[PDB]
Design a binder for this molecule. Structure first.
Ligand code: THR
Length: 390
């Protein structure tokens, strides 16, 4: 009746870049001033997001719409990355893909013009007080029924021969499902790899067995790894408070961090009826799942090795603050039974953890402190809960 886990503070893994979501004031309503604070502030009742994703509009007359939310996110400590869905229409042409006509791609003779479009966006945002952390070549080049397709080889040509001219960190390829065929050619080409800064991926339908990426472990030194878009487990209307469904969000984040070694996890729309912030501006159950990571695992913390699945239905991750070697552990219990775990943290001088617990009936509730016996922290997880220990 007593499971065990070990957190090894000397086995450092990836440095955390942060957590957040998407704003898109052209497709939906912009975040309001108060919602910006709820998203990117880290007070009580705020999500503590540290990454904002925006879109690069094909029409430069829409670019000003991004500025207010991006400025406020940066002021509150976030970084901003931008992704394009289509080039300007004068750079696009059509082709027939798997027998479906009228599909879009970037004209091969416009790759330089496209570099200039992306640089123009970067310069416009810079002039408006938004120094982009990164810009992407293409959102979901491999699921572009409704936008612009790129084959692995088109992406490679761009990364190899053009991306070095972009005045920003370059993100690629943002496959819809982290399909490795989209990114392998970049990693295997020294020049394309040199021009890459961030390997970006989405997680739609990505299973745990597909989260590791051996080639990236081998070839990705100096490159960041970001999961730049998902919603899970669905986008059902008015689903954001569904319980225990919302536990799937925490589990997907656990998996990104521990199974994928991801440094960033970015939702789709921040404010939506299936998102982390509801249309009334309050945090949803799905949002509290994100918050268990985002409020506590701050940028610059480093994930460390920790028993990831100490007993059935229990999932554990741990990240260290290198300033003082303190630890943040996020523990999910999907069981209908409470679980007691002896968590060994050998070599720590820390002797007390505070904890915050979300269940179907409470949100980030501060509960009784855990007092260690030596280097062991005995914790009890309520059924169907997430706990962050700090
Ligand atoms: C076997 C099952 O009934 C068990 N007693 C439980 O904890 O739910």
């Amino acid at each position: 009746h007593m499971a065990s886990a070990t957190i090894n503070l000397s086995a450092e893994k990836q440095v955390i870049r942060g957590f957040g979501g998407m704003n898109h004031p052209v497709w939906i309503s912009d975040l309001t001033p108060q919602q910006r604070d709820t998203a990117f502030g880290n007070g009580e009742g705020q999500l503590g997001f540290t990454i904002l994703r925006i879109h690069v509009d094909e029409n430069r007359n829409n670019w000003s719409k991004e500025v207010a939310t991006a400025r406020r996110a940066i002021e509150l400590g976030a970084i901003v990355s931008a992704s394009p869905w289509n080039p300007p229409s004068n750079m696009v042409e059509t082709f027939t893909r798997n027998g479906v006509p009228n599909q879009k791609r970037l004209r091969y003779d416009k790759y330089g013009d496209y570099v200039q479009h992306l640089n123009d966006f970067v310069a416009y945002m810079k002039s408006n007080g938004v120094d982009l952390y990164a810009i992407s070549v293409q959102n979901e080049p491999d699921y572009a029924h409704e936008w612009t397709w790129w084959t692995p080889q088109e992406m490679l040509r761009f990364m190899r021969d053009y991306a070095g001219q972009i005045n920003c960190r370059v993100m690629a390829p943002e496959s819809f499902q982290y399909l490795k065929n989209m990114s392998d050619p970049i990693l295997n080409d020294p020049q394309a790899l040199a021009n890459l800064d961030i390997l970006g991926a989405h997680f739609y339908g990505t299973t745990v067995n597909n989260m590791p990426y051996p080639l990236f472990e081998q070839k990705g030194a100096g490159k960041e790894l970001w999961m730049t878009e998902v919603y899970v487990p669905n986008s059902d209307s008015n689903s954001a408070d569904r319980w225990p469904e919302a536990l799937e969000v925490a589990h997907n984040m656990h998996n990104a961090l521990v199974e994928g070694n991801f440094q960033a996890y970015v939702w789709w729309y921040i404010r939506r009826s299936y998102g982390p912030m509801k249309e009334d501006g309050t945090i949803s159950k799905r949002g509290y799942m994100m918050a268990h990571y985002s409020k506590f695992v701050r940028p610059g913390y480093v994930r460390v090795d920790a028993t990831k699945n100490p007993t059935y239905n229990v999932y554990l991750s741990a990240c260290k603050n290198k300033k003082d070697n303190s630890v943040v552990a996020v523990v999910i219990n999907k069981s209908t039974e409470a679980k007691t775990i002896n968590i060994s943290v050998p070599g720590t001088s820390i002797r007390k953890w505070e904890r915050y617990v979300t269940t179907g009936s409470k949100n980030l509730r501060k509960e009784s402190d855990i007092n260690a016996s030596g280097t062991t922290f005995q914790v009890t997880l309520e059924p169907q809960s997430v706990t962050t220990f700090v």
